[PDB]
């Protein structure tokens, strides 16, 4: 009632309206007016910016004036729209955000499967609006004006079941539809995406040949000399010794296959890891049987492992199961040429020009690939390693870009959950008007935040905001 409190709240609500409409209109201009930005995700973001700007301009003002002044001035039609639009707007924006999380989950988890096209995005947006308006419809249908003694009032006359069941059913249905369900769906999608991205995911500032000394030839000769071997084509395995997973058993079977051939004299093997005692005794058994095989079961520093990746000719990764194949990125960044099973992330990282791929679990195919690598070592291998280094670096810039965007969207959804929790708890409480003023300001402030999040956490949006201003 104090006029300053009223001027305070008038200034705050006007700040919400101007920041939300300016920022969201700027976002729609940024995505639509610039050709490169017309992606599927950005179309859904335009829908959310359209809904948030619309609800700000058409509802924040009247919610403030009618809340403080306790008098309806805008007629029956706008009483219905005032109680109707905000549900549909929240539905359109939050389910546009669900479309964004779903699109990233598709692009990351099943890249080969087709995402829907731009015009298909427009159809999905129209379906989003249909479901939004039809969910919001019952409330706008039951709003009405009561002309009365001192004032006109805008009230929702829910059907007169004495237990107030129909009203409570509608409110729980809306809250589930536009808060809990979308937050759970988006939470599963971005949790899957975030775990697989963080685990993907190599420190390129460390796994880098620049910290190695000398030519690769000098390093290979010094390394083999330290193991008691003389120069040869050098293969390395590093990983846990186990059965049915990291494939050291397939490599040992392949080593026994090569051991009877004359080409085996020209090969060197360095098997590194710890695990099954039988695989350890088998690898050690191969180590005493052949002078070109060396086994290291003790733990090594990562600086020494980087020394190995930069000295050996090839790294063998015969995994049965390899979700991420980070060891291949470590070898390729250091110029070792991978010979790996076509499983999991290894199939995604390695290409025809950047490694040698084989069927998982087939030792003869692996030995044949090792013989092919020996024949390839005859010719210069520098461009092959260059293609491997370029591939490992470019794959990491990808994963970094995806982690940056997905972190931004997580901030968007988090802002949504924070802004809407007090509101939904307030209206579902019945089943303190200063508290209503605060909760209403916080709930309707969410419309101004998305343009700020895009400007701060996304370089493309930052360039577009500096272009407009
Ligand atoms: C900003 O305003 C809104 C924002 C989101 C949803 C709904 C509204 C308006 N609806 C409120 C207002 C009074 C009538 N019902 C209420 C209600 C409360 C909770 C679920 C569903 C409805």
Author numbering: 27 to 226, 1218 to 1413, 238 to 272, 283 to 320
What did the published study say regarding this structure?
Within this system, SP represents the preferred endogenous agonist of NK1R4. Here, we report three crystal structures of the human NK1R bound to CP-99,994 and the clinically approved antagonists aprepitant and netupitant at 3.27, 2.40 and 2.20 Å resolution, respectively. Overall, NK1R exhibits the canonical GPCR architecture comprising seven transmembrane helices (I–VII) with helix 8 lying parallel to the membrane plane. Taken together, the NK1R structures in complex with different antagonists capture the inactive receptor conformation.
